[PDB]
Each structure stands twice: as structure tokens, then as C-alpha cells.
Symmetry: D2
Subunit: 115 residues, 4 copies
């Protein structure tokens, strides 16, 4: 699988468990087409979103539902969600890990792109 | 004004200068309507995006055009942009820290 | 002055207020000699740590007392402090963003 | 092993490979005693630093040699290194992952403490 998503919690120092993640791909008319979704495991990781076959070059949006994560913990968050938007490229390395570190009023996201 | 945007370059340790920023507000038909736009100054700050009268309650999206920033500096980054989405109901400062394959964003909300 | 320290609270989305900061400078016998100290104001800023005359070349350590900050707010954090170590040879702004189990730190260096 | 260290590179979007990591523990006289060391693998991770037997409660410093990492890539860095200082606690969870995301003038560090 060429796309993995991992989410961590900076308040409790733990994986962010059961976080909904929605992936979209930009359609030719510039709207966002649903592409894949899931929820992070107990390790904070979401595997198996897609296959090499279906992960063609294009612009993708990964939406991490941070607001519902914080509310389910009883914590008031700022953002509606975390959005990661990128163009995949076949010339570059094969595997994309999208990682997000969450705080209630802040988040960081990084791409680890490897083979 | 009630909404300010600050952008820093983590590779250079400098303000991110000339960064375009587009603000959208979700419309009654839940599409993104253009709201305001501008670009950061030499301090990395974007002031005067809006007014207290116009910054009404709603769901806002601050799009920071990071890809155009890095490309103007001769670099091919990972992200298309950095999108900060929040509901407003007060001064908001939206801060972002940029690296070619990473960004961090924080909200500082005061009165 | 040539050295300023800014601290933000990522849980609250606010300046980190009353944060103690101790600056050290490596001595000729490579131990850490105390250099200056202070604490952040209501803006989360610490101005006036030193002067251009006293901020000579050297290896500096800015210790931000994050543990005491979180504990004063009733919270048990992970880190003892946040230590920023750098060589100087110009205004340095040392910025830190704090969560109970995480911190980020950036250097903004200008003239 | 109760202590793992992982390092990522935010400029290239990759693991930070071959980064020297030194761990110290505070001695009774308040000096830092060498405790363990290694270099990150090709996955950016450093396993096997210590055992449960030797990782007693105490104050530990993890020093990540970021400056040598950036210089070996030909990139001018700001910090001498990244320091993570914490008190381990036996009552809390069993495993400590110390993770650091590196940029030349910035770094982030987080603790993932699990079982
Ligand atoms: O920007 C981010 O998402 C980020 C991520 C990490 C991180 C990455 C991978 C991992 F297994 C653990 C981490 F803490 C550490 C710091 C950080 O800022
Ligand atoms: O999330 C962010 O936007 C962020 C911002 C800063 C930062 C903000 C303002 C400033 F003058 C200097 C900084 F390093 C530092 C770290 C960081 O993560
Ligand atoms: O590394 C940091 O210290 C850092 C700092 C900021 C930040 C700095 C200054 C400010 F006025 C607001 C901020 F969110 C935002 C993100 C960040 O990582």
C-alpha cells in the first residue's frame, strides 16, 4: 500500500486512536472526489487505504477529523480538521506516510516519502 | 483587525516573505466562498485581511500558498498549500511554520 | 536587545505567561556558566535578557522551564524543560510552542 | 527495550539516517552520566539502547546530534543538537518513544508513552 496515515496526541503523549481519516482526489472539474477512508488503529496508524493500482498520479487531500477526536476526549479544540493536500508523483519514491501531531490549538504534519 | 496571519521559514530561520494567503468562508449552500486575500510582508505578517464588521460568525478556511512560496525560491515542496479550517464565534492570529515536506500551524486567540 | 524569547501554549492557543527562562553560556572550561534569566510577560515574550555588549560570541543554552509552567497550571508534563543550544557569531528570536508531551522550537535570526 | 528514538527530516521528507544519539542519566551529584548511545537506522529509528533492567527511574537526557546530520548533507543548521530531558516513571506506561522532526532552524520533539 503506497499511502499510510499516522496520528499522534501531544497532550497525552500517545497515538491518536480511532481518528477518522478521509482521502479525496481532485477530479477533472476541480471538485474533491471521495477516494478512501478509515480510522486509526490503537497504534495511531491507518494502513490499507489504497493499492498501487488505484493510487494514480494526481492531487490528493487527506482530511484528519481532529475536532471529533478532541471532543470525544472532553477537550475543546480549535480546528475543524487537519488537511494535507499534495500532488503524488510516480517519478519520486514509492511510499507516502502522512504523519500528524495534534494539539488542541495546533498541529504539525510531515510527509515521509520512501521506498 | 480581528484576523492576522504570520508565516515563518524553518529552513532559513526567517519570516516567510511574499506568501499569498486566501481566506474562504463556508456559504449557506456549504461551498467555500472567497472572503479575503493578501500576502505576507517583510515581517512575515499579513495584516488588514478583514474588519470586525465583516468577520462574522462562520466556518473559515485560511489557505496559505506554500507551494508557490517554495517554488518562487527555487524549491519543489511536498504540499500544495497549508489549509487551516476553523469555526469562529476576539483576535485570531494564524501562525504557520514552513519546511519543504512539513508545516506546523497554531492559533493564538485573544481579546 | 539581541536575544528575545517567545513562548506559546498549544493547548490553550495563548501566549505562555510567566515562563521562567535561564540562559547559559559555555565557559572556557566547557561547563555551562549562568548568563541571564527572566520570565515571559503577558504577551509570552521575554525582552531585555542581555545587551549587545554582553552577548558575545559563544555557545549558548536557552533553558525554558516548561515543567514548572505546566505544573503551575495543575498539569503533569513529560519534559523537564526545553533546551535550545546554539552557537552565535544580529537579533535572535527563540520561539517555543508547548504541549504537555511535546514542544517545538524555532530560531528567527535577522539584523 | 523501554526506550526508542526516531528522527525524521522535514526538508527531504525522509527518515533522518545515521544520526548520532547519546543518552545520559543524572547522577546524584547532578552531573550527566553517559548511559547509552547509537545511530539511527535507515528507517530513522534507534532500537536497543537499553534494557528494562538498566532503565531505572531517574532523569534522562537524550541528545540528538542534529548539527552533524545537517552538515553531512551540506546544509547550514542553527542548533548544536536537540535535547530531550525527562523523568522516567515506573507507575506510568512501559515504553518511551522519543520522536524528533528536524528542520535546519527548527525542531519538534514528542514523547509517545505506551504499553
Ligand atoms: O509534524 C509531524 O507530524 C511530527 C511527527 C512526528 C512523528 C512521526 C512519526 C512517528 F512515528 C512519531 C512521531 F512522533 C514527530 C514530530 C512532528 O512534528
Ligand atoms: O505552528 C506554528 O506556526 C509555529 C510558529 C512559530 C513561530 C511563530 C511566530 C514567530 F515570530 C516565530 C516562530 F518561530 C514557531 C513554531 C511553530 O510551530
Ligand atoms: O517552533 C515554534 O516555536 C513555533 C512557534 C509558533 C508561534 C510563534 C509566535 C507566535 F506569535 C505564534 C506562534 F504560533 C508556531 C509554531 C511553532 O512550531
Amino acid at each position: 500500500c503506497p499511502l499510510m496515515v499516522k496520528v499522534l496526541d501531544a497532550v497525552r503523549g500517545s497515538p491518536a486512536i480511532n481518528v477518522a481519516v478521509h482521502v479525496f482526489r481532485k477530479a477533472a472539474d476541480d471538485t474533491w472526489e471521495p477516494f478512501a477512508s478509515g480510522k486509526t488503529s490503537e497504534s495511531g496508524e491507518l494502513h490499507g487505504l489504497t493499492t498501487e493500482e488505484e493510487f494514480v498520479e494526481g492531487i490528493y487531500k487527506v482530511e484528519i477529523d481532529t475536532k471529533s477526536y478532541w471532543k470525544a476526549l472532553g477537550i475543546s479544540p480549535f480546528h475543524e480538521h487537519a488537511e494535507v493536500v499534495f500532488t503524488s508523483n510516480d517519478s519520486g519514491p514509492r511510499r507516502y506516510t502522512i504523519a500528524a501531531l495534534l494539539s488542541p490549538y495546533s498541529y504539525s504534519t510531515t510527509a515521509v516519502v520512501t521506498n
